[PDB]
């Protein structure tokens, strides 16, 4: 009843909020990564390795909110 | 008592008599100077200057460059400058017409750049001549 209801919402806001910051973060980083490639195409190999590395670091941040959301929906210990 | 102006061309120092106000074009579009101005450095676009000292204010068209303004002092680096009174207006207008005609014909990636910068040059000559 109430326990399930609270958990479903906690599952909604966990993944809802998690994407706010990194969604913005990856944006500036990628865009700024591209501008540099435009400036120095010969450096594309160098730039891409870091850019891809960064997104994974940023991408996970929303993974934690995704995992907890699922642990709330599917493997929920409290119901 | 006032700020002082020295406008200078690559061969010839044109205006080195000192004034209470000038107002000059720039690449931003327009600026005005009055005495004890803060230190500023503006790249000045080709196009007319207007300088007021005392009673009389007159425009000498000048052809772009750099203008820094220090404490109590302006110096303007321009590659070519003419007094607007000393150019006779009609001849300048005729030159402008010629420039326009050549521009209309002029074609190709460098050449138009030349035509466009020449017609930009010519058009500002009359705008000091009339003013």
């Amino acid at each position: 009843p109430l326990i399930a209801a609270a958990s479903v919402i906690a599952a909604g806001l966990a993944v809802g909020l998690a994407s706010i910051g990194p969604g913005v973060g990856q944006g500036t980083a990628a865009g700024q990564a591209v501008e540099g490639i435009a400036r120095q195409p010969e450096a594309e190999g160098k730039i891409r390795g870091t850019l891809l590395l960064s997104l994974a670091f940023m991408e996970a941040l929303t993974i934690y909110g995704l995992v907890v959301a699922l642990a709330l929906l599917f493997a929920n210990p409290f119901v | 008592m006032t700020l002082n102006l020295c406008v200078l061309t690559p061969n010839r120092s044109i205006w080195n008599s000192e004034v209470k106000e000038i107002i000059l074009s720039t690449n931003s579009g327009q600026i005005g100077v009055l005495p004890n101005h803060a230190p500023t450095a503006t790249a000045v676009d080709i196009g007319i200057l207007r300088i007021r000292l005392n009673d009389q204010w007159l425009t000498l068209a000048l052809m772009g460059g750099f203008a820094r303004i220090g404490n109590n002092e302006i110096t303007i680096l321009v590659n070519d400058a003419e007094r607007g009174s000393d150019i006779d207006p009609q001849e300048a207008q005729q030159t402008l017409e010629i420039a326009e005609a050549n521009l209309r014909k002029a074609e190709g990636k460098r050449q138009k750049i030349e035509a466009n910068l020449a017609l930009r040059r010519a058009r500002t000559r009359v705008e000091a001549s009339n003013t």
């Binding site: 891809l52 994974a56 991408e59 993974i63 | -």
Partner: protein, 223 residues
């Protein structure tokens, strides 16, 4: 008003509207094509330059997206463009609210998602076929080559490309049709024309984007 529709049964139920509507799409495509193909001339005649410029456009998109080996996939990406484009434009411009089905409105092949997730599975089979064709059978793009701990993101990524590509096309066609329906009850046909225009403007683009994006996944296989 209604997102309901009538099934036809062969022991299992399949939507009647989508089969009939995509049949009209197949007929209009083969009809105008086999018109334009019968008497080729060295200098493009009247009406054949349009089909020719279509082919040129398709070639260019595939080539940009795929690369030097664009020319085997040109019929596939050309069909992804033309079937989705003609699907949306047939749903927009062919007057089908005069026609009354037993149970549902007939608008487009793409309105039922089934079309959208089928076309997404076909681009999935396409880029899996390119990737297991040109590259090593042992591994394709999915290998966690850059980082071993990049596997979870990468495995997830494979699932998402067909879902987003399946969903964007489907949602967009359906959303546009709904606006035309939900507007029309409120008001008569004159008010809604601009909206339909806007939807018609997206109706090609979500086609084109699909084909473009589909071609791009082929490129991610071939590298």
């Amino acid at each position: 008003v209604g997102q309901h529709f009538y099934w036809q049964i062969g022991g299992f139920q399949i939507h009647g509207q989508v089969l009939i509507t995509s049949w009209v799409v197949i007929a209009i495509l083969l009809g105008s094509a086999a018109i334009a193909v019968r008497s080729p001339q060295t200098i493009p005649t009247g009406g054949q330059n349009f089909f020719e410029y279509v082919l040129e456009f398709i070639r260019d998109v595939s080539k940009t997206q795929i690369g030097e080996e664009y020319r085997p996939w040109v019929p596939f990406i050309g069909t992804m463009f033309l079937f989705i484009f003609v699907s949306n434009w047939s749903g927009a411009l062919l007057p089908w609210k005069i026609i009354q089905l037993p149970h549902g409105e007939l608008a487009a092949p793409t309105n039922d998602i089934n079309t959208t997730v089928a076309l997404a599975l076909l681009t999935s089979v396409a880029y899996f076929y390119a990737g297991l064709t040109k590259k090593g059978l042992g591994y394709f793009g999915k290998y966690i080559q850059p980082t071993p701990i990049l596997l979870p993101i990468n495995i997830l990524e494979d699932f998402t490309k067909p879902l987003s590509l399946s969903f964007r096309l489907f949602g967009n066609i359906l959303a546009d049709e709904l606006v035309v329906v939900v507007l029309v009850s409120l008001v008569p046909l004159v008010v809604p024309i601009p909206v339909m225009f806007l939807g018609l403007f997206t109706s090609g683009i979500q086609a084109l984007i699909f084909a473009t994006l589909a071609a791009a996944y082929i490129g991610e296989s071939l590298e």
